[PDB]
Design an enzyme around this catalytic site. Structure first.
Site, PDB file in Angstrom:
ATOM      1  N   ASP A 128       0.013  -2.719  -1.626  1.00  0.00           N
ATOM      2  CA  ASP A 128       0.161  -3.549  -2.401  1.00  0.00           C
ATOM      3  C   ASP A 128       0.508  -5.126  -2.678  1.00  0.00           C
ATOM      4  O   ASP A 128      -0.244  -5.589  -2.789  1.00  0.00           O
ATOM      5  CB  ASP A 128       1.511  -3.142  -4.154  1.00  0.00           C
ATOM      6  CG  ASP A 128       1.994  -2.009  -3.336  1.00  0.00           C
ATOM      7  OD1 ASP A 128       0.773  -0.793  -4.849  1.00  0.00           O
ATOM      8  OD2 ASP A 128       2.613  -1.735  -4.217  1.00  0.00           O
ATOM      9  N   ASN A 153       5.355  -4.333  -7.396  1.00  0.00           N
ATOM     10  CA  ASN A 153       5.124  -5.385  -6.043  1.00  0.00           C
ATOM     11  C   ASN A 153       3.972  -6.405  -5.760  1.00  0.00           C
ATOM     12  O   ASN A 153       3.962  -7.296  -5.388  1.00  0.00           O
ATOM     13  CB  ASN A 153       4.748  -3.870  -4.907  1.00  0.00           C
ATOM     14  CG  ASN A 153       5.926  -3.114  -5.126  1.00  0.00           C
ATOM     15  OD1 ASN A 153       6.814  -3.037  -5.847  1.00  0.00           O
ATOM     16  ND2 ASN A 153       5.747  -2.118  -4.230  1.00  0.00           N
ATOM     17  N   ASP A 194      10.217  -2.794  -1.457  1.00  0.00           N
ATOM     18  CA  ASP A 194       8.750  -2.962  -1.334  1.00  0.00           C
ATOM     19  C   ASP A 194       8.158  -4.057  -1.799  1.00  0.00           C
ATOM     20  O   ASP A 194       7.242  -3.973  -2.255  1.00  0.00           O
ATOM     21  CB  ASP A 194       9.153  -1.661  -3.232  1.00  0.00           C
ATOM     22  CG  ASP A 194       9.963  -1.041  -3.430  1.00  0.00           C
ATOM     23  OD1 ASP A 194      10.049  -0.549  -1.824  1.00  0.00           O
ATOM     24  OD2 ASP A 194       9.163  -0.097  -4.520  1.00  0.00           O
TER      25      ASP A 194
END
Ligand SMILES: [Ca+2]
Ligand SMILES: [Ca+2]
Ligand SMILES: [Ca+2]
Ligand SMILES: [Ca+2]
Ligand SMILES: [Ca+2]
Ligand SMILES: [Ca+2]
Ligand SMILES: [Ca+2]
Ligand SMILES: [Ca+2]
Ligand code: NI
Ligand code: NI
Ligand code: NI
Ligand code: NI
Ligand code: NI
Ligand code: NI
Ligand code: NI
Ligand code: NI
Ligand code: NI
Ligand code: NI
Ligand code: NI
Ligand code: NI
Ligand code: NI
Ligand code: NI
Lengths: 329, 329, 326, 329, 326, 326
Positions: free
Chosen positions: B278, B42, B314
């Site tokens: 992330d 990510n 994601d």
């Protein structure tokens, strides 16, 4: 309630709308939800949903997308008799429906559409407006193409000849023109306009009128000023407070007989805000045709346009009863 | 803005993610939405979305799921040159996206994945990190399999030989190991780490450091303490206030040159919180490579990671402009 | 690995699901495709360094088209960015006696308005072992004939092999119009991909009984006599309906025709089948396949494309060879 | 936890539920999401989800819709042994899931359903209730058809003969009958009822009992009054504060041993509120069978019914652990 | 443009996607359709002023059915509104050896309970060039036989052409029951649409070898001898399976049969095919098509319907004529 | 009603929609299935007390698999719960010349790691009239051969009829490996279900010309001579493509072959067809069908499965008998 065979006419562009599902961005999507809409089309669809004889005037290509747009209008009760057919393509827009801090995003692909390239001869305004009680346009339309300002002027001269009530939603879009060009074109049209629909930006930009603190008193003062300059029978103004793409507060003002009338203010968790301003306009037109008192015009139109925020797509799916039920709390 | 051919490398596991649509639970669903992600993947996707040369290092099986994961990475601009191919399966996780009082639920199925069983010889760290300006890993990775701690140590020794900047997001997961094992493994790696990314739990658990009242002063004090022990150039810390699965408040702190810098705090109606940490890490790496001032690093990275909460999947789908636009309010 | 290069327009494709017509649908399936993009995707899938040259807008559709290309392994380094929009086509996938139907909406695409300066052919074709283009591209915009000429002159100077898929389209130009532009281009084409139709309208060559192998061999030798192509590849669709077709190809090489096995196909999506034939023929030429293996491999590859939704193949060499071996 | 082979029986109507996706209105939709539910079916499904032996008693047609409804019940663990088969159709309802100021809307199509036309001989109450620890019905059922009041009376006489604990959720629906008819029919049934489940409207309408300010003291007073008149072992009352279709506050009260017990109050962003009252009832039955203390009965049942608001469809998909986890905060 | 009028019940149709059975599905595709609604939709699509007469509830399903009709160009001015519900049918679309399966749920529909006062036939049929009905309608409710009689008497008085599609249904009535009601109606029918089955059960006429052209011509002349129809139109489905059928029609006119081309169809959705045959036959009669053109046009139109999801055609005259010309 | 019992692994099945490949899809359709689970589902659908024995994790996938089984009427009382995961397979449903493709992900499933103590065979098989298993199961995990042996010894002691579907899989074991484990099991098998392939690899028996009835009869008598089965049932797929197959079965009983009608099938989903053949053969044995009725019924049932999405039939006895009667 009863159907009212009152002929109402609107004019502008209807586009194919392509939106990814489920708050997906364009980049990520394997599909697009399909619908058809546009400012003045959405108004016609509102008036048809209320049970009036709404005609939408436009040009669409003879291809399946033009057929679908027309059939979408008819499904909602809009009469398509005055849709000219011809040209090369339908206009399109892609819409990413935002959430929370991520705003909704539009990518337009409307250039060179059949309506954008429409000619004055495409429309018989004497036939179209025969028997019309009302004519509605928005400021989105003049800048779309070369003849469109002349086409509107044609329509407005006939409306004026026939004593047809004329509304305009100013709908300023900086994507389409500068505030200087908008003022050069729209100010002359105000001579023909009886009912103004706007927000505060639209009035500063298109009309060059402004006040400090935009506060009911300030909004009341702006409407007086526009009313004194242009002699409008009615001014309807939308009041959006854009907390995020997910929650907005929403209310309206109707100014008539020298007096402002503020609706209830709603806090809305939004499904699809597209068309909300157009449903306000629809509802204000509807209320004026029905002879609603001024306060009721504000409450009914706030209620209706609040509810649009809850309905996927550009057109309302609403009954009179549903709107009144909300307004009545 | 411009593409920057700055080579950045991340390492870890990418998994197939299977989530029911529309807040359905696993038990009830006739389908799963498909995507591919993982903490360090990510990050790579964020850096690619910003226009850097992001390489993700991992192992995937030669089967269609491994091919799809690789193609998903490439679609977002991540370079797949250093993906080793081999082993038996791709790791999977099932995700139920929660709402209101019902939290999101993950069922993991990652054991015996190709990366989990990767060997030290699968990766040529001298080739991989040649010319790299940056190397990123997270604490999720060491406990995934037998050789993984040795594989990271291999990478970190080369990074150190080559003068490559090294970041670590501590990412403590009790599912994966005890705080005692995490401390035994991660504390030695801190010798190689220049930039720490964490939350308060990660620091108590993995580093054994804590303070009362976790309050800006307290968070500032924790970052000083970690900075004095490990000599980090930068500490970035995320601050989530989990009101429900539907609304969280979110903000970050960047601590550098002896000083804390707190971002704006956002109230977010969440679409998909997966990847938000992330994207923070991504944005902090990006900001450090660009030479952002410390306050701007915090605002930009808070903005970016806030926005991730609005995007299904994601990986971020974001431009620099979009993030700056948010940060600038 | 071998660098191959193709050039043309990639489009957003919008198709209703489940054999629905545009009129009835509340959604469109999304993909991205185009003749030469599809060829590059094929070659990328076979493991070559395939680069697709075009121009896209700096908008999310442009971004997604480029991402789709990368997903399939295609290199996007030489995609110019600018312009106002991406081209679109809408596709109703037909069934039985109802043919598929395309509505084009590609005018004023970024590629249609590309300028010659947008493309550095010396850099693009450096180290290239192959360059492919189609006759769809020149009529798309004012400078594309000159852009193609720039590329072909550089291909000639570097000694890069050149393939052209004639792909006559009546919507885009007239039979006369194709002839004025394409016939000069044949000077730099080594491998021709075509069908009965393209050859008549673009090349001014016609033979009886093609709607028969000897007829097909005759047209290919006449083409080869006139323009001296190393290879002529012709697809042979027998269109019973939009559901079932018979499918075979001919490769003509060393003055001899080579006809593939004939496949009866229940079609999933025939878009891009011709393009995967071309990709397969290119790949087979680079790998030194004998002419007959070249025909069987290209037939099998293009048969398989009919089974795969969208414009690009998702195929391995092993998969293609498995079918060809039966 | 452990399965408990405690036999519980519920009786009523299960319907096919047809809802457009994504907050679409019926008018606009090309499809309907399909599920099966009904007040007493939903209770049975809750009790099965908790690991008891829940049987649902009803009549369904021998057609694929009746087969699907039965298979939906079994999937959730409900035993279908006592479902009579016969008649002409399954009942249906169409549901538009609302948002913000737009309420959810139900169009019913349940008339002439197989259960509505069921005969007393369709059900062997002596066999059905043999070994039952509990029997549950709601006030929705008597007015559905001609014999249904007699069928319930048959069931209740056997329950009373066998010493089976009897609960009733009053579930007043003005669509189904007047408060006068409801009172004429339901008051006599209270002689057989041990545990009352209701909201304030249900008690005013069906029982003719009311108090000013419906305030814990007032709700406590109403429960005493119903307890003194009908000698109920337990009164469970739901407390919904309907801010919009998107946000409600939710809490419950359990009154037993002369004392009220109020749960925590939750603010819920709603996914699907359908079934929430039934899960309350389910949870209250479950708690009573397990011998939960009175406060724990309230917290557990508030938690469970809160969580139902987060789950698409009519039935809960919940474990004991998940509910306890919420209740414990 | 020419005013044409049809009358009957339109229903909400619910079908699982992707050949799923009702038992396995978590959703239903939604559309609206019915024999005579489908005819009106056909005629509207050919550009006639087609009005569909029925009754629907004042609820969203009633609203959506009427909107669907308008979408397709059908005029809804003469739809009465009231009653408690819309009729429904559930349809599993079959495949290969598994036939499609319908579960009806139409009892107590607003139309089933319509009263004669609900319909002003003088106003409805004023200026009408045609009136179509089917034998599905009379058994649906107590007053529908009398409602149809009111309409037919007015059609007779105005000299409006009348078509009837016999559409025998065993679920709705018995062979004996159809005969008592329909045979009196034949007095006002000019154009008969039917199949082997409908003719036996409703008309009491039977011939050997129909499960052969001479057999089909024989039944049509016997029908025509007995009731003096201007036209008899018979569809000829050869049902190999739910996937592939052979399809043709016969039009009998001027004492002669006229058989269409025979189409082999891979079916998308055969619902409404018979109705598009009837629409096409009506349209062909209004436009003065010769009998053989009338058969080819109606065969081609109804073949095409098999390729289109749902109950209504989405077709242009040019599309139908393109197929017929092959 | 009659208690029947099957044993093996049920899996989560993930398939892209609309003939998409795994590479291209953004979703997977979900179902649950497995050879012996599918048999139990068949028998449950015919109205028997069918119990499926296996082991699943205590997680939502395990919950959903068990719920799916119950939905179809299968009893789940004897499902052991524990372990770390459910097995998975991914399935690309092919078309025309592109075969379907399975990616297995079943290793370390709760069932693969089951222990003998997990299953009380005396309680499970008490009152059972039948026990079915397949050769897919023994290679799945260390104790499954011994688990199966425990069950078979108890079946033998209770006098419960036993069927085995050989189901050789090369992925799971070698031809040699199957033989060491299965041939001892034949001692307790009364009814064999197999194909040409399974018989060669597992049983070490081969005959010429099977890729012909006399050849098929010959192999069945040789099998029956060697192991003394009451019944041998063999499915005969003629695989033209992934779209169209010819389908028939043979039942061999009383020393005579019995061949069914041959169906040409346009396939929706062929997964589980073999299993519905086995279910149908079991059901036919319990109901005293004559051998020829047994073949026709099982052919018709398994033909129908090809038309139904997923692994389980959704079928009634009346539906199967309707097809068989043609
Ligand atoms: Ca009113
Ligand atoms: Ca900037
Ligand atoms: Ca749709
Ligand atoms: Ca959705
Ligand atoms: Ca507990
Ligand atoms: Ca589909
Ligand atoms: Ca579904
Ligand atoms: Ca998708
Ligand atoms: Ni009117
Ligand atoms: Ni529409
Ligand atoms: Ni670079
Ligand atoms: Ni992806
Ligand atoms: Ni793509
Ligand atoms: Ni040769
Ligand atoms: Ni029990
Ligand atoms: Ni269900
Ligand atoms: Ni909120
Ligand atoms: Ni429709
Ligand atoms: Ni003739
Ligand atoms: Ni299931
Ligand atoms: Ni076929
Ligand atoms: Ni025999």
């Amino acid at each position: 309630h009863h159907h009212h065979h009152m002929k109402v006419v609107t004019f502008g562009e209807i586009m194919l709308r392509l939106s990814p599902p489920d708050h997906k961005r364009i980049f990520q999507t394997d599909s697009f939800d399909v619908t058809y809409g546009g400012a003045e089309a959405n108004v016609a669809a509102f008036l048809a949903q209320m049970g009036l004889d709404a005609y939408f005037v436009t040009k669409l290509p003879n291809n399946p997308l033009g057929d679908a747009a027309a059939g979408h209008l008819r499904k909602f009760g809009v009469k398509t008799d005055y849709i000219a057919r011809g040209g090369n393509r339908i206009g399109i827009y892609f819409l990413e429906i935002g959430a929370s801090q991520r705003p909704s995003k539009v990518v337009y692909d409307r250039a060179h559409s059949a309506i954008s390239e429409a000619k004055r001869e495409d429309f018989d305004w004497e036939k179209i407006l025969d028997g019309a009680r009302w004519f509605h346009f928005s400021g989105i339309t003049p800048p779309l193409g070369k003849e469109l300002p002349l086409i509107l002027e044609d329509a407005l001269k006939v409306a004026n000849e026939k004593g047809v009530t004329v509304s305009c939603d100013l709908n300023y879009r900086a994507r389409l023109w500068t505030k200087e060009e908008a003022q050069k074109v729209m100010i002359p049209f105000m001579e023909y306009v009886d009912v103004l629909i706007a927000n505060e930006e639209d009035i500063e930009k298109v009309l060059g009128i402004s006040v400090e603190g935009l506060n009911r008193e300030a909004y009341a003062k702006i409407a007086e000023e526009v009313t004194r300059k242009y002699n409008f029978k009615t001014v309807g103004i939308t009041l959006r407070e854009s907390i995020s793409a997910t929650v907005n507060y929403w209310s309206v003002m109707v100014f008539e007989n020298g007096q402002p009338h503020f609706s209830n203010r709603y806090e809305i968790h939004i499904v699809d805000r597209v068309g909300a301003g157009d449903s306000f306009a629809g509802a204000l037109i509807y209320g004026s045709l029905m002879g609603f008192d001024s306060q009721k015009k504000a409450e009914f139109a706030a209620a209706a346009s609040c509810l649009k925020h809850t309905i996927p797509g550009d057109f309302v799916v609403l009954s009179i009863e549903e709107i009144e039920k909300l307004a009545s709390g």
